[PDB]
Amino acid sequence: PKQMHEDYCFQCGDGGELVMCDKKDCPKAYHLLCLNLTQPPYGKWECPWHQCDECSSAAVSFCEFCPHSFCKDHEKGALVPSALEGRLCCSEHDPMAP
């Protein structure tokens, strides 16, 4: 049945206790340990998918397999299609087995 967030950690892929992103329309959820957070954040928390991993600027292009993402300055050449339905992946993944 329809839920707004995913059932698996976007970082490691395992289930369990997951913090949910507060960014409008973001379905991503994460283990606290995987984000190096000690406690669930107080109040509003937006996940790392929204900020460029190079510079912190707002992301415009998004890895489909992990929270790496890229602003307008850093997005060209950042992602390639993968064997899983052509879904885009960053350099952390083997595109044949992302």
Binding site: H5, L18, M20
Partner: peptide, 6 residues
């Protein structure tokens, strides 16, 4: 921020 359990 909120949590869910799976």
């Amino acid at each position: 921020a909120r949590t869910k359990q799976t």
